[PDB]
């Protein structure tokens, strides 16, 4: 999706990793002035285009637009609050919670990733009745040979 003023890029690899921010104004073809009132550290700055990943979001806006205009307009859409809603955003905050996590939270996760992986099988075993599975489907048909004997 096209990069232009008002596009809502996601910074990738820099000091401001995950953070997003609207493309205030194009400079030339390899740079832009990113901005975003919602984060403390997304004061207007020159991101390289290599560094940003355009998002599907993009407020309508005019080049070299003043910042207070932006703390306005994005507020009237909540392009940001709308953005965090997406799995693409949650995945970024999700990995940003696991890396940020303490050891007991990782217990507190493994207990769930087993609590669920256990019930994934419990659901499946119940549903094992309906084929197929190597253990059940192979066997039901497998008996077909046994019945013939």
């Amino acid at each position: 999706n096209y990069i232009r003023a008002g596009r809502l890029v996601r910074i990738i690899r820099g000091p401001r990793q995950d953070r997003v921010g609207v493309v205030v104004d194009i400079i030339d073809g390899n740079r832009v002035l990113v901005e975003n009132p919602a984060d403390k550290k997304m004061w207007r700055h020159v991101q390289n285009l290599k560094n940003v990943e355009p998002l599907k979001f993009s407020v309508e806006l005019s080049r070299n637009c003043s910042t207070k205009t932006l703390k306005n307009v994005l507020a009237e859409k909540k392009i940001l609050e709308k953005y965090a809603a997406t799995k693409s955003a949650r995945r970024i905050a999700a990995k940003r919670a696991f890396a940020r996590s303490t050891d007991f939270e990782r217990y507190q996760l493994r207990v769930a990733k087993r609590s669920r992986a256990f019930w994934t099988r419990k659901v499946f075993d119940e549903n094992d009745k309906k084929k197929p599975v190597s253990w059940h489907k192979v066997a039901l048909k497998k008996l077909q040979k046994n019945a013939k004997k």
């Binding site: 992986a117 099988r121 499946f124 075993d125 094992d128 599975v133 253990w135 059940h136 192979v138 066997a139 497998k142 008996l143 040979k145 046994n146």
Partner: protein, 136 residues
């Protein structure tokens, strides 16, 4: 005897493998080689490429961590609890070191193994860099 194969199909309800035995609390490194220039190697300072360390600021995390080149001889020899722990008498042997400092901007670190060099056979081979002494 396929009689037994039919019986086996009913009983299996569908499990999974689970790792429930002895944990490893060491990272798996590699003895990438001795520290060296174009002119040759310093056999008294090994380089150790720890898995998933990729970065220099991770490599810094590992400084001081004790490191092991475990291998084996062809006969048993005295080990740390040869008498207290007979169970432990392998012809398995181990050479210990310390991660000394990060090497390069990647995840590699420098390990001096005691006063001695680690043997050149160790190269390309599993060093095991332990999480201790702990800091964190």
């Amino acid at each position: 005897n396929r009689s037994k194969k039919i019986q086996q199909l009913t009983k299996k309800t569908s499990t999974v493998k689970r790792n429930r035995k002895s944990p490893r609390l060491y990272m798996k490194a590699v003895l990438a080689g001795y520290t060296r220039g174009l002119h040759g190697q310093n056999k008294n300072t090994a380089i150790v490429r720890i898995e998933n360390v990729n970065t220099k600021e991770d490599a810094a995390w590992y400084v001081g961590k004790r490191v092991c080149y475990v291998y084996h001889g062809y006969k048993m020899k005295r080990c740390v609890r040869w008498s207290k722990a007979p169970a432990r008498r392998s012809n398995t042997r181990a050479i210990w070191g310390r991660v000394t400092r990060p090497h390069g901007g990647s995840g590699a670190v420098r390990a001096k193994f005691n006063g001695s060099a680690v043997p050149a056979s160790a190269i390309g081979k599993r060093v095991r860099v332990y999480l201790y002494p702990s800091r964190i």
